[PDB]
Amino acid sequence: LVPVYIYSPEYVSMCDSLAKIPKRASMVHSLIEAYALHKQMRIVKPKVASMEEMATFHTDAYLQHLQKVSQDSIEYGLGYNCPATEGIFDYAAAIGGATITAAQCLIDGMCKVAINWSGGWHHAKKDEASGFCYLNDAVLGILRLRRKFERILYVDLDLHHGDGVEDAFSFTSKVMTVSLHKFSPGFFPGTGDVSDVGLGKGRYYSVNVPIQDGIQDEKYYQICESVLKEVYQAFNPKAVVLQLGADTIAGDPMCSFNMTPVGIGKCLKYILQWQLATLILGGGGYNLANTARCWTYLTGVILGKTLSSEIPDHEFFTAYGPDYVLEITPSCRPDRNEPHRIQQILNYIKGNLKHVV
Ligand SMILES: CN(C)c1ccc(C(=O)NCCCCCCC(=O)NO)cc1
Ligand SMILES: [K+]
Ligand SMILES: [K+]
Ligand SMILES: [Zn+2]
């Protein structure tokens, strides 16, 4: 009954090697640990994903190519965004197996919530890398949950549209994907408008909520709670995979949304309250200190605790200036979401869900 935490020194050290988020893994860990939150969690060492576990989603041509490259390259999306970095195959296997490992505990009753903050790589296609994602651990995690669960719900709270995971299940009704991302022409990955609902046997089993800059905690929680309520109704899931990219939080260099760890928490609370199994994943988050602040605070609402406002002294204390507090103050930027558009969106979504059995 104690939340599982996927950690291991070798793992975190492996993740700190990710180009875009250097040392972000350590920062998140050490901050969560400096709050002694790991004392109230079942620490589980992550297992490396095997070539056959990754093959449950990715093609051999892709996986083998990714492997040879790990030692004509821009063939499988391995270009500007996803470079042919030496050792990526090993980094992705570690992160992928870290989610497979967390998924297994959920289908073992060993816990009702497993956490893998270093995961959440939602852009990767079965045979294509995208948006710094070489392997789609979110899909590998959901496919593992399918061993014991019939209806799995995937909620993507990342600033970006979880296309990789949506594409994976766009033709199926066994897994429903919900994504609240910023949608605007020329913004990555450019998909996910509200009209996007899935194909074939999976029509309407894909929900997309396009948002605009500036949105804040309450405006966001209303939209999220609203959509998550209608969804639990029609789909009535058995397990839940939650992607919590912190690139929505105020202060991120992404400078799009204007959330705080508490806005997301209200959403997290609302989902945890369904008492269904739950696989927590990180994702984007480009303001290192803030990301540790957000996920630590969230590892706090997962344990019903209320963390200390003053940031405990630790390994990376200095990176928490100039105030050294766990709270994030929203930026003074205008919300660009006209309330009428949010309604048209919510209705269109509402009428898209009636079609569910
Ligand atoms: C200043 N500089 C060198 C850059 C600035 C912006 C990008 C970018 O937006 N790239 C597009 C990829 C967006 C990240 C998607 C991964 C993600 O956040 N998933 O949730 C790249 C480089
Ligand atoms: K689907
Ligand atoms: K999203
Ligand atoms: Zn993102």
Swiss-Prot record:
Residues bound to substrate: 81, 131, 286
Tissues in which the UniProt entry reports expression: Weakly expressed in most tissues. Expressed at higher level in heart, brain, kidney and pancreas and also in liver, lung, placenta, prostate and kidney.
Post-translational modification: Phosphorylated by PKA on serine 39. Phosphorylation reduces deacetylase activity observed preferentially on histones H3 and H4.
Gene3D superfamilies linked: Histone deacetylase domain
Region of interest (Histone deacetylase), residue spans: 1-304
Catalytic residue positions: 123
Required cofactor names: a divalent metal cation
Biological process terms in GO annotation: chromatin organization; heterochromatin formation; mitotic sister chromatid cohesion; negative regulation of protein ubiquitination; negative regulation of transcription by RNA polymerase II; regulation of protein stability; regulation of telomere maintenance
Entry annotated with the keyword Transcription: yes
Oligomer status and interactors: Interacts with PEPB2-MYH11, a fusion protein consisting of the 165 N-terminal residues of CBF-beta (PEPB2) with the tail region of MYH11 produced by the inversion Inv(16)(p13q22), a translocation associated with acute myeloid leukemia of M4EO subtype. The PEPB2-MYH1 fusion protein also interacts with RUNX1, a well known transcriptional regulator, suggesting that the interaction with HDAC8 may participate in the conversion of RUNX1 into a constitutive transcriptional repressor. Interacts with CBFA2T3.
Function: Histone deacetylase that catalyzes the deacetylation of lysine residues on the N-terminal part of the core histones (H2A, H2B, H3 and H4). Histone deacetylation gives a tag for epigenetic repression and plays an important role in transcriptional regulation, cell cycle progression and developmental events. Histone deacetylases act via the formation of large multiprotein complexes. Also involved in the deacetylation of cohesin complex protein SMC3 regulating release of cohesin complexes from chromatin. May play a role in smooth muscle cell contractility.
Listed GO MF terms: DNA-binding transcription factor binding; histone deacetylase activity; histone deacetylase activity, hydrolytic mechanism; histone decrotonylase activity; Hsp70 protein binding; Hsp90 protein binding; metal ion binding; protein lysine deacetylase activity
Gene Ontology cellular component terms for the protein in this record: cytoplasm; histone deacetylase complex; nuclear chromosome; nucleoplasm; nucleus
Gene: HDAC8
Protein's name in the database: Histone deacetylase 8
InterPro entries, alphabetized: HDAC_PDAC, His_deacetylse, His_deacetylse_1, His_deacetylse_dom, His_deacetylse_dom_sf, Ureohydrolase_dom_sf
Variant or mutagenesis effect after changing residue 123 to A: Loss of catalytic activity
Known regulation of activity: Its activity is inhibited by trichostatin A (TSA), suberoylanilide hydroxamic acid (SAHA), 3-(1-methyl-4-phenylacetyl-1H-2-pyrrolyl)-N-hydroxy-2-propenamide (APHA), 4-dimethylamino-N-(6-hydroxycarbamoyethyl)benzamide-N-hydroxy-7-(4-dimethylaminobenzoyl)aminoheptanamide (MS-344), 5-(4-methyl-benzoylamino)-biphenyl-3,4'-dicarboxylic acid 3-dimethylamide 4'-hydroxyamide (CRA-A) and butyrate.
Binding site for a divalent metal cation: 158, 160, 247
